[PDB]
Amino acid sequence: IIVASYTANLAAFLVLDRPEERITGINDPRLRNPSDKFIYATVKQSSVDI
Amino acid sequence: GSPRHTVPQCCYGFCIDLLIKLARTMNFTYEVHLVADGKFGTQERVNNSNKKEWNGMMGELLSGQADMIVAPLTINNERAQYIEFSKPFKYQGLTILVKKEIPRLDSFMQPFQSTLWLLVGLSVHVVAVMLYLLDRFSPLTLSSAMWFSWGVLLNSAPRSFSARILGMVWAGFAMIIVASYTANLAAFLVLDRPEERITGINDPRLRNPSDKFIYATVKQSSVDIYFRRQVELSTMYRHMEKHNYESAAEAIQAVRDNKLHAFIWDSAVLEFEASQKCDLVTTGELFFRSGFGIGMRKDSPWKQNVSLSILKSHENGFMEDLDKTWVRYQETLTFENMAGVFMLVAGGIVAGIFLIFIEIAYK
Amino acid sequence: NGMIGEVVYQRAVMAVGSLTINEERSEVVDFSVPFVETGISVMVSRSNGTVSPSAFLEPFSASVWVMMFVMLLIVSAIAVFVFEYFSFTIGKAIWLLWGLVFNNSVPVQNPKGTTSKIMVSVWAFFAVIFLASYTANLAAFMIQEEFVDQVTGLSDKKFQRPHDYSPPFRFGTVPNGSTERNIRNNYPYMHQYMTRFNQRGVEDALVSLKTGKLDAFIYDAAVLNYKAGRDEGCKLVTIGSGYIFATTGYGIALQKGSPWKRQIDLALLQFVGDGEM
Amino acid sequence: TVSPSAFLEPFSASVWVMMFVMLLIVSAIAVFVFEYFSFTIGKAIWLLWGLVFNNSVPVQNPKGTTSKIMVSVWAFFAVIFLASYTANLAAFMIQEEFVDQVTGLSDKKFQRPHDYSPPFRFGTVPNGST
Amino acid sequence: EELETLWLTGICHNSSQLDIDNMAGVFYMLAAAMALSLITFIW
Ligand SMILES: *[C@@H]1O[C@H](CO)[C@@H](O)[C@H](O)[C@H]1NC(C)=O
Ligand SMILES: *[C@@H]1O[C@H](CO)[C@@H](O)[C@H](O)[C@H]1NC(C)=O
Ligand SMILES: *[C@@H]1O[C@H](CO)[C@@H](O)[C@H](O)[C@H]1NC(C)=O
Ligand SMILES: *[C@@H]1O[C@H](CO)[C@@H](O)[C@H](O)[C@H]1NC(C)=O
């Protein structure tokens, strides 16, 4: 029972809990309200800024 | 349904205890009765005067035959233009009740196709035959060779000078096959959760439905008015206008017998019904978080202190007591899947004992 | 004082900003209809923890154990019959099948009477079934992460006295807040133990909950929900959604006798009744 | 399904050589103990790689204490890399994709459907700009 | 983009069974084992 639980536990570590940790949704208001480390940038004098 | 049958019976429950609390707080008497129809009341065109009128509880209230409506008041913009409201007692939204509860032998031998067992059997037969022929050309002998060929597969030794490589490859073969079978059986029973829900009002498959997406609402209800004012519901309205049902229990019995497939209804009532009937799971997207209050008349001396008593019920744990009455009041197994496993085990044991009878009767 | 001091003393007109609604505020002014579900809730540290691997009752449920003993008795009786056909394995055939449940026992010399090898092959195939079933049982245990709640709700036994339990803790609110009046109208001792556990700022209490300078904190529900929705690391999944709590709403406070009540109420019902809210 | 090729070469390509290295080291230790202090000269490789799986293969009882220590260490090692092999099977199962049948407008199927055994079919709507 | 949100859908995105190819490759390794056993058997 111990070694089968150990086997299933080591099978359970690599199962991707925390699949995505960032703010990849564009309508997520952390884009609307940035922080000290949420650093997004653009090209100086480009069409994206306009 | 019934031509004329109106009797005094017993009434109790949530709003009855709310009325008991109102009578305990304030200083009045009352008389409890019911509405004739089973409808809320809609601003519907009547045949004469080209004017939309009301019916139901609103019809009995505007006629003066009703004094105070105590009901799950769907507080909306339409009814407030005609009567006055109270402050709400219940915070409750809308959700979709569907039937995604699909139960299950877990595909051991009989539901699954028989390539694996016949393949392993013919393979171990070929292995035992060539091991016995290598035992003949060595660089109960046949029974010992066959029993060792089973015992390498068994996972719980003859002359193998030029045969130990064959035995070790067969042993690694047997363990990698049973490991692959364990891995993909666990893999199939973990990821056995497909998409069977609707995901709220923003479902384009229900914006243009078909003959399988059978969804409706209560006939002549405020939910139909709320969908009729909004313009992105009209096609759904054209689906719902032909299958509207009178009471919610009609919808329960319909979608339980799969006459329906989805139903728009209040959240906590469907939570209570899911506590009652364990085969009911609502969707995830909660939409239109609404409020239930008390249907009231216009400017009246029973408007101020009544709402103050409602707020007095909000500030203390009496709402929690009402939750304790009805809201909080809720309700590899190897007995269905591995039962046929035990049946085939017992049948194989009986057949093996019969073959032992034949073997003893022969020798 | 504040917005109540502006509206009641009529230096302002209405309270458009966010404001809780309770009894004496409804005494001094006339509110509008509520529009947003903003109760109260409790934010704690609520770290990772474990997944609580207590036990397992899925394969056997205290009734397949009878089937195991019956199969042991059948195997022992057939082994007695085989050894009668062919002097130390009367009750030791039970141990022979019973140590080979987990296929690592002392190897007893199996008889060549063709019966015992068949029943050992059947039991080994059953072993192939149930070790896979145990891996399935733990695989059905790690589906989604969980963390047990130290506090069930506002009626917690830990809220009586933290000295009764072996870890003591602490709970806070906002100073001069309506939550304080809601507590003092409900529980005096809660206010008494909160008085020594005061704080100043909302972000200050947030840092005190993150850095361990505060254990529990009591505030309005939806504000803490929005703060958890923007949380650095998102390590704050609160207890429920405000079920054992005050469960109130927000509105607009108007002066007693203002003619703007019905129009603003109809406008709020229009703003909710079209999906614009 | 995803239809994988096998489970040996895309998974154990740099591990298999070191597993043979440890196998030869343990077999050399077994031969050195068998010659230092009945068939642990050449059959020990078959014995050791049968201790990888332990599929009910009775071999012998090792009278050497060093042999029993190596059996214990090799059994614990076999359990833990069997656990890692099941974990890697799960990790290969975690992703889900679908292999495309036709991966080009210049496909070899598009020359003639006699090239493959099922005769496939494809058409258009008439009078179209396509 | 609002009209693309209104007049399109995006819920559809991009099944367990025994692979046939895996034990086929194991059978190729097995046939190599038969070949090596025959080579060691004839000499
Ligand atoms: C409360 O109700 C009773 C009902 O008979 C009535 O007689 C009494 O006058 C009421 N109390 C007051 C103070 O109004
Ligand atoms: C049609 O018109 C009459 C006019 O009095 C109205 O009373 C009646 O309700 C309508 N028809 C029905 C439903 O009998
Ligand atoms: C409402 O309650 C107040 C006391 O809080 C009382 O003075 C007043 O008469 C009541 N009005 C009515 C008619 O309910
Ligand atoms: C709270 O009220 C007290 C009353 O003395 C006083 O400290 C001050 O007015 C307020 N302080 C804070 C923290 O708001």
Ligand SMILES: *[C@@H]1O[C@H](CO)[C@@H](O)[C@H](O)[C@H]1NC(C)=O
């Ligand atoms: C294409 O258009 C022509 C003219 O209408 C028509 O005769 C022809 O049948 C069309 N093609 C087909 C096969 O639909």
